[PDB]
Amino acid sequence: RPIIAFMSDLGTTDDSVAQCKGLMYSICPDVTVVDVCHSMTPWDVEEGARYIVDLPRFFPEGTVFATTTYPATGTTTRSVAVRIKQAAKGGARGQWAGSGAGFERAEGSYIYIAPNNGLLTTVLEEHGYLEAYEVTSPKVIPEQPEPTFYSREMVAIPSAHLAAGFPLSEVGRPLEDHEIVRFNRPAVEQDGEALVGVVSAIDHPFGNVWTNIHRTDLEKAGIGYGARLRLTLDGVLPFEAPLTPTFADAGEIGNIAIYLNSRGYLSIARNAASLAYPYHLKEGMSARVEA
Amino acid sequence: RPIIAFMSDLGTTDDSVAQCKGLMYSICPDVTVVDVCHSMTPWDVEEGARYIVDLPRFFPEGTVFATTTYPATGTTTRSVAVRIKQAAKGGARGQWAGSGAGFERAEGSYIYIAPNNGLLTTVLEEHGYLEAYEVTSPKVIPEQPEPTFYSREMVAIPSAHLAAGFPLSEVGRPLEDHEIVRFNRPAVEQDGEALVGVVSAIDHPFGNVWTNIHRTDLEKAGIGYGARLRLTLDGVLPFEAPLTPTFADAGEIGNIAIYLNSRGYLSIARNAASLAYPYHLKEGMSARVEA
Amino acid sequence: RPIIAFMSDLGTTDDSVAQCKGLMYSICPDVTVVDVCHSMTPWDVEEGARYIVDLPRFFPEGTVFATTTYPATGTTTRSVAVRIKQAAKGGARGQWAGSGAGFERAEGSYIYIAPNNGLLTTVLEEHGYLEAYEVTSPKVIPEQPEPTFYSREMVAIPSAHLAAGFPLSEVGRPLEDHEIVRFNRPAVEQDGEALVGVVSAIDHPFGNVWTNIHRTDLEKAGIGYGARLRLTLDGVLPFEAPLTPTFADAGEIGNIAIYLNSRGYLSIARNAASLAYPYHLKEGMSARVEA
Amino acid sequence: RPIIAFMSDLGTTDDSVAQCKGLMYSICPDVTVVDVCHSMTPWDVEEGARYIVDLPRFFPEGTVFATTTYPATGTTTRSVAVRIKQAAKGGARGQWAGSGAGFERAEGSYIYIAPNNGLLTTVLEEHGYLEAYEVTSPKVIPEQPEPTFYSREMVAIPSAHLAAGFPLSEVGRPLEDHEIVRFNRPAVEQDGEALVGVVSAIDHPFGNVWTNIHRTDLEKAGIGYGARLRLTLDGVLPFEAPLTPTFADAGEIGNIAIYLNSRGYLSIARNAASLAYPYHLKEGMSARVEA
Amino acid sequence: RPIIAFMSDLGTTDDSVAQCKGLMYSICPDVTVVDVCHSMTPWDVEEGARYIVDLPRFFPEGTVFATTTYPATGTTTRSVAVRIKQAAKGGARGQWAGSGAGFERAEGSYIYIAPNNGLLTTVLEEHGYLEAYEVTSPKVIPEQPEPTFYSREMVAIPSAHLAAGFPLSEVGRPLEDHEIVRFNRPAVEQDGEALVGVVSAIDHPFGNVWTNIHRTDLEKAGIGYGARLRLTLDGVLPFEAPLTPTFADAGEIGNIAIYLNSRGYLSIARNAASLAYPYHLKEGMSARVEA
Amino acid sequence: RPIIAFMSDLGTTDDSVAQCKGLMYSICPDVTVVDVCHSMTPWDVEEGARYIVDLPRFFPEGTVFATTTYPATGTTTRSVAVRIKQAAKGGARGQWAGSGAGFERAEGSYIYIAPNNGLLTTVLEEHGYLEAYEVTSPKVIPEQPEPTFYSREMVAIPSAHLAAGFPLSEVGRPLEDHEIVRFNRPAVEQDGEALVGVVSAIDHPFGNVWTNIHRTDLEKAGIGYGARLRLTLDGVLPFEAPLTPTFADAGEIGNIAIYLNSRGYLSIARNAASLAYPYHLKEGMSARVEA
Ligand SMILES: Nc1ncnc2c1ncn2[C@@H]1O[C@H](CF)[C@@H](O)[C@H]1O
């Protein structure tokens, strides 16, 4: 019953993803390939990271995550494959996902394979890891990889070997922690009783605005549900509401809701109306919150 | 070989749909998840309804339809799960899908689970139902559901239990008919001998124009194939053509075809050219037809 | 084990693709349906051809390719089903896909089913074929096909019977070569020294520019990796770079790379930046290359 | 030295204004024609009114204002010509315009000629009038006016006769006050200590936002320069600044300025940056202000 | 008293028009410069023609028309200066412009100066001409003309000398009729009964649709006011209305009016709403009319 | 016959420019007001400068240039009024505008009045000046100037007094050279033997591309007419052509012309087609030229 959950920047407009899938079914006949998404901004490693960081607790143990934007395709770089440690706790977000009390996942139960370009930065931060290897063995990659298609050659193909039971430690040599490329995550700042961050994403298709200011940052400031907040975007577009659990708490349709999203980050929206689209709000815009 | 057919407003730009799928495979390991679409206009319950109403006759018996736009997420509302009666929008004669004379489907062979917000209005009207229940059991939903993700908590999760053979009647208490929310469907009005309705959809990616004017409305004003029609749109733009079964009946490429769509509604198109896009025709525009 | 790889112009915005998939699972319960793509420009048979021509070597033997844009839907036309000969564009060696030396695929191991409208022109040219039949038998198509949905009736449905092991030669009468509709492929011309073609596609989502000037055309001029080229787009844009294997060979981010894409065609891009989007370059613009 | 100041909806893209001007120079050889503007939204009488209400104090005594949007062109309607009473005081706005203490204008010194469609509503409100006449005499309009060009026939042409010294009372019969069409001006409301109005205009080319909340309404509420204000636009986009005389009082470039515009209305802008354009703010959006 | 009416493709976004005007005042101190328009599509001589053909009857006798789009700037080409014959399109009666019965204009009373590129084609056709000269004398053009600014050097400058009374016949040698470049005017054709032309212009800023089907073409078919017409735009839009004198005859706001515009051509619009803009109708689309 | 040539950022969509003109005619009854343009990007002092720097040689002696973008409106700043020295950007030989050998203009024949914000930087550099004064006298500005309209109060009004013969030296105290604000003009840098500059403007309405690379920069790297050039734009888009005096030298319509504009700067265009618009070329993009 193996699963590969596949996240790329290949888009869905041509046969690129299908070539990868065909090879996945070829290598691992029993596999199920689940699309995460293929629409990320090409080469935006930070955005790709957002789409994969929270996946493990949702998937059956033993799932392989094939995650790739590969701007260094065709160079001497090689992918990294890592077995993560914890599926939740740090990335708990509530706790375990599923019905009842949720589904507890054993430690060391998920593998990610990716370009070694920092794509896995937040996965490693949130989940930790037990082992990491450079992906070099001709048992799991082509002897003559297509220079402009490493998302296929160096990620899709070896992910299928791993799903098929190829031993992780046999993909190539162990990588020391310092050899795993990471991106810098900008910290939430204090100024002086207010918290200053950024719009991390526009939540399509709804036009909700998500910031990088986390529940932990709020509860550190004595901010919880019911707190009257001022949330200023782009430095000049401000908004005022109490922090509420959900959209409908804003009352009438179109009213402003300030809430915590399902990943636990301070967010702003209109109730059953789009906030970002009419005002052309964008990721990267500053976001400041105060009580 | 259980199937879940999954229709949401979650989009395909982030990991939202994948989180749902991971849980489906977690709960029902042998499941096949089939995407209906995830692109509907958020919170447009009437549009969501059109994408799900005619699904049962195409699917194997025992398929579960997980269908959701959930603007009331995080409120005290709970989903409804219903077993439908007739698979066909027909009866005796049926109009079954498939090769030869098509595949007849037994009655009571399909379950829908959806927010109780009217999404199922036309499914219930066209198909009838045998039983309906409120979805409240912690055996099939989380004890601590994520307030902003009821499409996952209250639809995806329980649909996978249902696919896995969890008894429908055990998801919660029976709902009386009046407790199942319905939307009103605006009637085609009669203006002299013209039928007056609306553009119900622009049929992407083709730019065909679908109206809410049914064959039955037409064959009550004296109109069948071959009839010379005048179809007026948005109160301004006029077209004239005989009613024909298909696009190529219009003759040359670009010529106007007035026809009945595969759902049996009065529609207008250009033959192998887009009608809607160059004239910026839109859903909700008035549509008037006369012989 | 059977697989149907499905390429259509139906889009991903309504239930059209799902209706086809439901019927595929109905007819061939153990099938895996793999999406190629559903976003092609409607009725653009040359574009559809590009998404399907290179598929066979990526898929397990016995895979059925259901490939369809059907502007002649509802007419007396019938689909064609063909068994291809060679899975490669090559053979001597092969450039087989996969890890190690790749997966060699037996001859006669793939079936395409498509409208007989030229969609398979390049499939037939690159792979050859062993047999071809008109798709007419009520064992594999509806007795009463929906006039406006032949992509479902005349492609999806019979593809599932073929996947389930329905004998290919029983779908209908053999077709003679001349009865298989072909489109003309404009040839890459010569004057010089130089080579005059077109932009065949903008490679979404990256904005790379693909030409119809093939590596075999380049070989014909003794043009290889390292050669300083002038590539003029649209008649007035003399791009200059050496031919290199990949994007990063251009050096700095945003620099011009002239390269051979994974399909083997002369292409041009910027290194980890979009070439086509900022300057609105488009398919159909002229492309001239010289050393 | 006569002047006609000319405001129309004819645009500047064809010869329409030039035909009018040629006739003006023909009728009144010594005249100077000054363009006010020709770009108003066609048929928007309220917008046209904004462009003409404040003109008299800027112009030499004896100036004729030819002001026209004529959606009733070619009907039995006839223009109105009015001599206004006061050039300023009510429409003082500071007081008199010009160097030193400004240029005092005698009463009864300006004539407007316009369609009788309410275009002059605010001119009459702010300035009063001494006499008003229907424009019917063949001495000042064509005997056979072009049905679709009353802006020329019934405004431009007679305005030139008036500039040339044709007696105002000879254009046709006197009009009683009730025969002069007026539009309704929505009042600024109180709720309960806040003032609720509308964005009256986006001030192009700067993207400043002008409201219909006047200095008089503010000083009625005890609001003056230095007051810390909250100005909420579109019901949800709020802004906070002190009321200042000018843009640069906001400090850094791009900072929000809340100010009184040169017509004396509460306005909001960014300092040397556009406010309206990045956020797509529009006329008609609600505007609420409170101290 | 002299007047120069100035039509160019120079735009209103830089100092180009002002440079020409400065030179006009330098050469003819007492001149009045009247702008026709400066916004024509550059190099579109047929469009430029439309803005200048009807000017003479609106202006005092002796007016000089400086009219220019000059794509051949900087070549050996020289402008043409012509004295026109008839100020009208008529004569018998005349439909003179102005109050009363209008201002009759003497023959031979207007001069056009233009590039010899066909810009004056319709001026010559409708008005006739008495004399024409090549503009070559260094008394009226620069000895060293700016290569890229012949609209200034070869039109604006000599127009001012002509306005100042420089003898027309002294500008250079007489031109024979065949040396005056003309463009072809596509004829209004017949098949029926019906009349087949084109949309000649979208009438900005209103979005009315003007055709090249003239009142004299309509008279030829016995088509007059009151006739129930079908006007098909773009081949597929059979508009139906009676021919009426003006917009308001259509009744309700937004209703279709088919009318004769002030230039005498069959036109179509909505009553106080834009026809062309919502449906993106364009110049060059086919136009067919029948009764 | 005094002239004021008027350049502002006020636009032509409301009554702002007309208010200024009315006051000009009020103060100087015999004045002619000539519009330069009113469309400049608000607050872009460098762009404003380009529209005014070469005006004097085209205008009669004694013309006053009223030139204004006033982002510091309502502050303690006051305008500067200067009498320039040389009318030509030349000296001996001069390069005079007009018919024959052009019209020589006496030294000290023109006055500019402008905000003291650097708008006059290039006027002063190219022309020199004889005297400069701060504009403060209540004889020429309002005692109570409208805070948000200094373009009217501190430019329009005093320019009309100056046109009327008010002694320049009486507007206020003399300004020392260091008190006249200047902007810095970025130099063309030298990279090997390539000249590196920028796109200074897109030349609307034509879509020609003007660079800041002067003939003098070129004829110092060894480039005159006939020289084969490579011009690279935005660091990506390449063009190649000989330097020619005009557009038609390129041959066929659409062919690339590299030329010197009427201001003597290196420019690039298509022959009677727009270059900038299809490729979305923009001001501020890098421009590099080499022989
Ligand atoms: N801004 C929103 N207002 C109301 N509902 C919303 C909003 N954004 C997302 N949703 C709904 O949340 C459900 C999550 F399961 C989705 O299906 C959206 O309908």
Ligand SMILES: Nc1ncnc2c1ncn2[C@@H]1O[C@H](CF)[C@@H](O)[C@H]1O
């Ligand atoms: N407007 C159309 N003209 C011709 N063919 C069309 C049109 N719209 C959709 N189609 C074709 O219908 C087939 C249904 F199976 C699709 O594959 C479209 O190509």
Ligand SMILES: Nc1ncnc2c1ncn2[C@@H]1O[C@H](CF)[C@@H](O)[C@H]1O
């Ligand atoms: N233009 C490009 N520059 C650098 N990388 C690119 C470019 N276009 C595509 N790619 C990467 O190639 C990988 C294919 F495997 C994709 O994942 C792109 O990230």
Ligand SMILES: Nc1ncnc2c1ncn2[C@@H]1O[C@H](CF)[C@@H](O)[C@H]1O
């Ligand atoms: N790119 C151009 N090609 C041909 N002619 C042009 C171009 N740009 C501007 N012009 C013409 O130059 C004349 C200057 F007087 C203008 O009238 C333009 O028509």
Ligand SMILES: Nc1ncnc2c1ncn2[C@@H]1O[C@H](CF)[C@@H](O)[C@H]1O
């Ligand atoms: N389509 C139109 N409907 C009603 N009025 C119109 C329309 N187009 C132009 N106009 C008016 O005609 C007058 C010409 F004098 C202009 O002022 C327009 O307001």
Ligand SMILES: Nc1ncnc2c1ncn2[C@@H]1O[C@H](CF)[C@@H](O)[C@H]1O
């Ligand atoms: N928002 C603005 N910030 C700074 N200056 C502005 C703004 N809007 C208009 N202006 C300037 O006001 C002057 C009025 F005379 C105009 O010329 C603008 O430059």
